[PDB]
Amino acid sequence: SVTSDRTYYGYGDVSVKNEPVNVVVSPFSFPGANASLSSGGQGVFKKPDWIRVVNQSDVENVKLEIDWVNANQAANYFDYARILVTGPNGQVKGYLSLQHGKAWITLDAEELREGAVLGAVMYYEVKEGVLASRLPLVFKVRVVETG
Amino acid sequence: WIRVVNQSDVENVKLEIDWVNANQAANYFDYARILVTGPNGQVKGYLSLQHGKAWITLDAEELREGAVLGAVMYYEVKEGVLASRLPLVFKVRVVETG
Amino acid sequence: SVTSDRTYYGYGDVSVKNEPVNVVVSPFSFPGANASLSSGGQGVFKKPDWIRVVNQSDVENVKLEIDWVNANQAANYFDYARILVTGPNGQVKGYLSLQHGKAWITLDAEELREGAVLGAVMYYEVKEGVLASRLPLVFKVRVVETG
Amino acid sequence: QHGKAWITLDAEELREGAVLGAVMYYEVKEGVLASRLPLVFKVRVVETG
Ligand SMILES: [Ca+2]
Ligand SMILES: [Ca+2]
Ligand SMILES: [Ca+2]
Ligand SMILES: [Ca+2]
Ligand SMILES: [Ca+2]
Ligand SMILES: [Ca+2]
Ligand SMILES: [Ca+2]
Ligand SMILES: [Ca+2]
Ligand SMILES: [Ca+2]
Report chain C's C-alpha Rg in angstroms: 23
> Resolution in A, one decimal?
3.4
Calpha distance C27→C32 (Å, rounded): 12
C6:D31 CB<8 A: no
Exposure pattern of C20-52 as b/e (b: 16+ CB <10 Å)?
bbbbbbebbebeeeeeeeeeeeeeebebeebbb
Q: Taking a contact as any Cβ pair under 8 Å apart, which residues of chain C between 22 and 61 contact chain A?
A: 22-26
B46:D40 CB<8 A: yes
Residues with CB under 5 A from ligand 7 (ion): C 147
Residue C124 and residue C92 in contact, taking contact as beta carbons nearer than 8 Å: no
Chain B CB contacts of D40 below 8 Å:
33, 35, 46
**Which among A12, A16, A147 has CB closest to B81?**
A16
Question: Rounded to the nearest 10 degrees, how much is the dihedral formed by the CA atoms of C20, A113, A61, B30?
Answer: 140
Chain A CB contacts of B94 below 8 Å:
6, 8
Q: Which chains are adjacent to chain C, needing at least 3 Cβ pairs under 8 Å?
A: A, B, D
Calpha distance A141→A96 (Å, rounded): 13
Question: Which of A56, A57, A58, A60 to mutate against chain D (most D CBs within 10 Å)?
Answer: A60
Q: Which of A65, A13, A45 is nearest to A121 (CA)?
A: A45
Exposure pattern of B72-97 as b/e (b: 16+ CB <10 Å)?
eebbebeeeeeeeebebebebbeebb
Residues with CB under 5 A from ligand 8 (ion): D 49
Angle at Cα C60 formed by Cα C59 and Cα C64, nearest 5°?
85
B86:A147 CB<8 A: no
Distance from CA of A95 to the nearest CA of D (A): 20
- What is the D48 CA–ligand 9 centroid distance (Å)? 8
Angle at Cα C28 formed by Cα C23 and Cα C34, nearest 5°?
155
In chain C, where do the E strands start and end? 7-14, 21-25, 42-55, 62-68, 78-86, 92-97, 102-103, 106-107, 116-126, 139-146
φ/ψ (deg, to 5) at C109: -65, -25
Residue C116 and residue C20 in contact, taking contact as beta carbons nearer than 8 Å: no
Q: Which amino acid is at A132?
A: A
Experimental approach taken: cryo-EM
| End-to-end alpha carbon distance in chain D | 31
Calpha distance C53→C22 (Å, rounded): 6
φ/ψ (deg, to 5) at A135: -70, 140
- What is the C55 CA–ligand 5 centroid distance (Å)? 9
Calpha distance B62→B14 (Å, rounded): 12
Nearest ligand, measured from the Cα of A93: 5
C7:B97 CB<8 A: no
Strand-pair partners of D42: C9
Residue B43 and residue B36 in contact, taking contact as beta carbons nearer than 8 Å: yes
